[PDB]
Amino acid sequence: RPYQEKSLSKMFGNGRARSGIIVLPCGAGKTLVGITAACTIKKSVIVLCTSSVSVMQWRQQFLXXXXXXXXXXXXXXXXXXXXXXXXXXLVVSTYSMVANXXXXXXXXXXXXXXXXXXXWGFIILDEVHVVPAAMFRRVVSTIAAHAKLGLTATLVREDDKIGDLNFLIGPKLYEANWMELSQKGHIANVQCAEVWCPMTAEFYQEYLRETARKRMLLYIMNPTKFQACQFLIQYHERRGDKIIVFSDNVYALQEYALKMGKPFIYGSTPQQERMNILQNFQYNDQINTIFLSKVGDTSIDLPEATCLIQISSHYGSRRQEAQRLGRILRAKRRNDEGFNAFFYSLVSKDTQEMYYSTKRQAFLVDQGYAFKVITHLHGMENIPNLAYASPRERRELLQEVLLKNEEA
DNA sequence: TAGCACGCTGTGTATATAATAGCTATGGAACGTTCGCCGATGTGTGTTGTACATACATAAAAATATCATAGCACAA
């Protein structure tokens, strides 16, 4: 990819003594850039990752290059260990395993052999936006190499600590514009859209009488959000496109999941059921609407479903939802003549959550994506299958929300 | 006059020779029937001691957000 050689030209310029951060999309090949840099340096390279799936991907890249089984390419994890050799090495480690404090499973010595014997020379950190934390400062404080590299896709955080990475690892060298990359490769056009649904009177006065995170249980459970949600679901099913529903709250995800009758993936869920739901979403055309929480978004991103719906949201964590949204957008690439990606933000008027979703839309403006407002698409008035459209169901839902407030 | 005893009559017995008719024991082959003592040495289990792989509540980490309290500032 041209931008990858545009990033490698900086390494080809000076050669020795360099450190910086390279911003590349998730769908791009930053791991290939790490492989090329590993071929240019030829030394013990350590790749800092947070999940085993990324370790398996880096191992697949090592297989795409050459060798992995002979005593040279090592693997560090809490399950097994593998030997290494000087002058050339490729190993992937976990942040929580290298960090620690005093808990030990007779494996911290195996890491202190890679760090004690001084077999290093190249540092690779996956997702640098997570570095602003004490454990990563300890990791950097326990390592020292000749060349450092930071592979990440985003860096927008409101912790005011992203600027420290300019001296902890190095200043950002190349930031690729996702619009020009969309022109190089169709990574699904980004259509940002907020749905403005009216707010009922009872949920408005009860919403004002509530506060903190409890008023979210009155912002999400609005009947017009159920009507507009069903209208968007039936609309996308009529267009023949799969639907992914995001929710920062597990309770709302279970409510919409059970009322819509679709599979759901949330916390404390068996992994076999998660894999079954994933296979049903990949193969079965009857399941075109999935309800995914943060566990289903951080662990895996699927290239299907051009329809992304956002209902639940948390205060301040708008940039993280923009990063996950960006992961689902960049995950969809196949060079199509159309390829229209639709992001909907179900927001209710006069609520305290839309005013942060606007900050998320500001983050979506900083990336160059297109944003437009949507009050209501004509067609919901012709859907007799809408729930909570009658005053009876609205009063019953009001009583259910009041009971939910009495439980919390 | 009938059993008993005596004399008389018929039969089997052994033998060569042939005629030349049916009659039959024999060995083989095939189908249907009830039935099937103390000492020394050596094995033989079963609950269970030992043991391994996956589940699951814990520990912890890590990542973060929001009310309360002290101090400083402002008002009835």
In whole angstroms, B37 C1' to A212 CA is: 96
Integer CA distances (angstroms), A172 to A40, A242, A320, in order:
20, 37, 20
DSSP state of A87: T
Please state, in angstroms and rounded to a whole number, the distance separating the CA atoms of residues A371 and A369. Answer: 7
What is the Cα–Cα distance from A175 to A185, expressed in whole angstroms? 17
Contacts of A196 (CB under 8 A, 6+ apart): A347, A348, A349, A373, A374, A375, A376
Angle (CA) A54-A59-A60 rounded to 5° is 95
A159 is near strand B: CB distance < 7 Å: yes
Distance CA A247, CA A234 (A): 19
| Three-state DSSP class for residue A127 | coil
Sheet with A289-292, side-by-side order of all strands: A264-265, A289-292, A243-246, A307-310, A340-348, A189-197, A370-374
Nucleotides of strand B within 7 Å of the protein's CB atoms: 56, 60-67
Looking at residue A125, its amino acid is L
Neighbours of A392 (CB within 10 A): 9
Q: Which residue has the tokens 């959000």?
A: A225
Tokens standing for A155? 């860096």
Q: How far apart are CA A121 and CA A347, in angstroms?
A: 50
Q: Are A179 and A346 in contact (CB under 8 A)?
A: no
- Which of chain A's residues 307-366 bind strand B, using a 7 Å CB cutoff? 314-317
Q: Is the CB of A130 under 7 A from strand B?
A: yes
Q: b/e map of A123-136 (b: 16 or more CB within 10 Å)?
A: bbbbbbbebbeeeb
**Which whole-number Å values give the CA distances from A82 to A59, A91, A114, A157, A258, in the listed order?**
13, 9, 11, 37, 46
Q: Write out the DSSP string of A318-350.
A: HHHHHHHHHHHHHH--S--SS-EEEEEEEEETT
Phi-psi category of A108—alpha, beta or left, where left has phi over 0 and alpha has psi -120 to 50? Answer: alpha
C-alpha separations of A407 from A311, A335, A403 in Å = 22, 50, 6
Q: What was the resolution (in A) of this experimentally determined structure?
A: 5.8
Experimental technique behind these coordinates: cryo-EM
Nearest nt (C1') from A319 Cα: B64
Closest nucleotide to A129's CA, by C1' atom? B63
Beta strands in A127-271 (DSSP E): 147-152, 172-175, 189-197, 243-246, 264-265
Whether CB of A212 is under 7 Å from strand B: the answer is yes
Beta bridge pairs of residue A310: A246, A345
What are the b/e assignments for A241-253, b being 16+ CB within 10 Å? bbbbbbbbbbbbb
Provide, in whole angstroms, the distance separating residue A316's CA from nucleotide B69's C1': 25
Measured at the CA of A181, the angle between CA A191 and CA A53, to 5 degrees, comes to 85
Q: Which two tokens stand for residue A153?
A: 């896709």
Residues A41, A42, A48, CA angle at the centre, nearest 5°? 80
DSSP string for residues in A179-212: HHHHHHS---EEEEEEEEE---HHHHHHHHH--G
Neighbour tally for A120: CB within 10 Å: 19
Residues in chain A after which the backbone breaks (C–N beyond 2.5 Å): none
From residues 269-288 of A, list those within 7 angstroms of strand B by Cβ.
Answer: 270
What is chain A's length?
Answer: 408
